[PDB]
Design a protein around this ligand. Structure first.
Ligand code: NA
Length: 388
């Protein structure tokens, strides 16, 4: 006779959360005894997804970063179901799913998002009489003060340029007034429009020069990787490191002997700090799924407060889902995520770029060399192609 059991795939890209995602899936299956959900985790998942979609083999539910060119192009080509009118989308913070809309239609549920800022050692700031900086000038002074008191302000991963993507995007964002303004200056300006003499460029150079203050970085930072800086920070060897919300689990796993805080990178004046990030646990549904009711039931389940709470309690990334109890003001990510999901939480600028690695490289190369005109030249070289 007939069987009704159906399997859907959930194509995961959050490998760090596989255990909890699998538990969730088992809870979903106990509530829905006729649905089986396969949590797919493969190496090189981004590239595998591209291969599968191109082949016409799209997973039923897909973890896809909604800032990506792939979400944009695939959503346009009809690869994903229009979620705009789903009741469960109402559980996402007002306005936030809409930041990745395509042709005014939402194709992805952003459960969580990353953010970026400065990790710092609360204990040593307290011992040294130091405060979170609220302007560019205070952040310079903070770094100098730390050096003067015989400690090392930053762990910088000179060998992993990507770690400074957020830092330089926020330097531009704060210099220009926001994310769209920063992309106006960099991306949607005229070819070769970026000039050393520009006030914007001067301000960007100021913010970047905070990372160039004499004595500001650990010895051999040039060669240091992400893991090295996570370790230096956890050991108390450096007082701060610029990075994203994704670093916390690794920091905690190093068992620091101090309380971790975070702060937003300030603007020129008080009350002008910003952060940057995008959807992380973020799902779309195939438009060609053989089992749309079950695929939607899985996505709906994860939007429930008691289900997302299971994920959040472990992962800690800010969540856009209603009803979740987020961590308090003393939690390590509090400063970084104070303004999550607001106008002060910009979507990564590369939403509207055709690549990003070369921006990482020009950023870190400036930290290395201090060659200001070279940096301007590198910025025009990277953005000019985008402007044809
Ligand atoms: Na059947």
């Amino acid at each position: 006779g007939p069987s009704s059991t159906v399997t859907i795939e959930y194509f995961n890209q959050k490998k760090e959360m596989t255990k909890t995602l699998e538990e969730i899936t088992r809870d979903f299956e106990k509530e829905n005894p006729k649905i089986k959900v396969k949590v797919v985790n493969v190496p090189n998942a981004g590239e595998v997804l591209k291969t599968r979609v191109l082949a016409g083999d799209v997973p039923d539910v897909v973890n896809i970063y909604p800032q990506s060119i792939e979400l944009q192009e695939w959503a346009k080509a009809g690869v994903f179901e229009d979620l705009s009118n789903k009741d469960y989308l109402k559980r996402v913070k007002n306005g936030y799913a809409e930041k990745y809309a395509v042709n005014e239609k939402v194709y992805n549920v952003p459960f969580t998002a990353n953010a970026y800022g400065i990790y710092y050692n609360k204990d040593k700031f307290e011992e040294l009489g130091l405060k979170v900086p609220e302007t560019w000038d205070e952040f310079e002074q903070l770094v100098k003060d730390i050096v003067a008191k015989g400690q090392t302000p930053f762990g910088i991963a000179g060998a992993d340029a990507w770690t400074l993507n957020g830092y330089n995007q926020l330097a531009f964002a704060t210099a220009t007034g926001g994310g769209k303004e920063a992309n106006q200056y960099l991306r949607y300006s005229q070819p070769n429009a970026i000039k050393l003499s520009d006030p914007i460029m001067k301000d960007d150079i100021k913010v970047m020069d905070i990372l160039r203050i004499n004595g500001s970085k650990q010895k051999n930072w040039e060669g240091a990787g992400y893991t090295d800086v996570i370790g230096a920070f956890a050991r108390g060897d450096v007082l701060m490191t610029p990075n994203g919300s994704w670093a916390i689990t690794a920091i905690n796993e190093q068992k620091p002997n101090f309380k971790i805080g975070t702060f937003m990178i300030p603007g020129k004046e008080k009350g002008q700090s910003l952060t940057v990030g995008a959807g992380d646990l973020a799902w779309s549904i195939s438009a060609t799924t053989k089992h749309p009711k079950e695929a939607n039931a899985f996505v709906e389940y994860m939007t429930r407060p008691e289900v997302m709470q299971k994920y959040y309690d472990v992962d800690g990334s800010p969540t856009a889902i209603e009803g979740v109890k987020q961590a308090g003001e003393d939690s390590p990510l509090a400063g970084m995520t104070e303004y999550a999901f607001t106008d002060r939480h910009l979507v990564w600028l590369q939403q509207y770029w055709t690549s990003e690695a070369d921006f990482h490289t020009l950023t870190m190369n400036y930290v290395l060399t201090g060659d200001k005109q070279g940096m301007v030249n590198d910025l025009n070289a990277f953005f000019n192609p985008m402007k044809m």
